[PDB]
Amino acid sequence: SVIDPSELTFVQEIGSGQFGLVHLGYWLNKDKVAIKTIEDFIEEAEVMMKLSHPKLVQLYGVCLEQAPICLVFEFMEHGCLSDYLRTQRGLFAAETLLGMCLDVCEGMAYLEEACVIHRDLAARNCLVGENQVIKVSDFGPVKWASPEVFSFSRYSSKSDVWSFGVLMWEVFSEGKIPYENRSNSEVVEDISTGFRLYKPRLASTHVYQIMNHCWKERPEDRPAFSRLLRQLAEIAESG
Numbered sequence: 309s310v311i312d313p314s315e316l317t318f319v320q321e322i323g324s325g326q327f328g329l330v331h332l333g334y335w336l337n338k339d340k341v342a343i344k345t346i347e348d349f350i351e352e353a354e355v356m357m358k359l360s361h362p363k364l365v366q367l368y369g370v371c372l373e374q375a376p377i378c379l380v381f382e383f384m385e386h387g388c389l390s391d392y393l394r395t396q397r398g399l400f401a402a403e404t405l406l407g408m409c410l411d412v413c414e415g416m417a418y419l420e421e422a423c424v425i426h427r428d429l430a431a432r433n434c435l436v437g438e439n440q441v442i443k444v445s446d447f448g449p450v451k452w453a454s455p456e457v458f459s460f461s462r463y464s465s466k467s468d469v470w471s472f473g474v475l476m477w478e479v480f481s482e483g484k485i486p487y488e489n490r491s492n493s494e495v496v497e498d499i500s501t502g503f504r505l506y507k508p509r510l511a512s513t514h515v516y517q518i519m520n521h522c523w524k525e526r527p528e529d530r531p532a533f534s535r536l537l538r539q540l541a542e543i544a545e546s547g
């Protein structure tokens with residue numbers, strides 16, 4: 309990485325050590341960003357900016373001088389996880405897919421500890437960056453929804469855990485559509501009767517056990533992301 313002089317602007321001398329004189333300066337950086345267009349939202353911005361974790365897409369600031377009002381986010385090199393898995397189907401090792409779930413689980417455990425509830429945890433709301441890293445976006449439909457959410461709209465970290473179970477299935481199936489040829493009412497019928505998404509070939513028996521644990525009827529039966537994180541981190545290290 310070489311910086312062209314145009315980008316640099318000297319300001320004042322800030323003393324000198326033994327080898328060379330040091331100066332204060334401003335470096336004009338032209339960085340890639342993802343810009344999302346549209347009292348009400350100005351409150352949300354500073355709070356979202358306080359939420360900092362390497363496994364969550366970062367909010368850099370909000371631009372609101374005039375309409376369309378827009379949010380400046382961290383750029384994620386390879387787009388949404390759903391499309392990433394779909395176009396790369398067959399090019400995935402079970403370790404890369406597990407590693408993707410662990411990435412999501414890290415950001416989710418932080419959001420759980422911060423008492424922030426995601427309402428749409430799905431592979432489409434997860435993004436791929438440098439060296440296949442996965443980060444969570446759109447934090448603050450029935451296929452990823454837990455019984456309490458499609459029946460009574462009762463959101464919590466445990467409903468986010470259900471969504472994570474569906475996300476894990478999307479990851480290990482390499483971006484396949486959950487309950488593909490079923491409608492919003494058919495999905496509700498099947499889940500209530502106790503049926504769950506099949507074990508994908510790439511997922512081990514232990515990974516599928518974790519998925520079904522995220523898919524328990526009672527939300528208090530489902531494990532916390534803090535519990536899910538320690539478990540997945542062990543499988544990722546031991547193999």
Ligand SMILES: N#Cc1cccc(Cn2cc(NC(=O)c3n[nH]c4cc(-c5cn[nH]c5)ccc34)cn2)c1
Pocket residue numbers: 340342344365381382383384385386387388435445446447
């Ligand atoms: N240079 C270049 C270039 C040009 C075209 C396509 C791509 C590949 N690609 C990368 C993305 N990245 C993003 O979409 C993205 N990167 N950061 C994001 C944040 C949000 C977001 C939405 N709500 N909250 C966050 C949504 C989307 C993003 C999409 N396609 C890269």
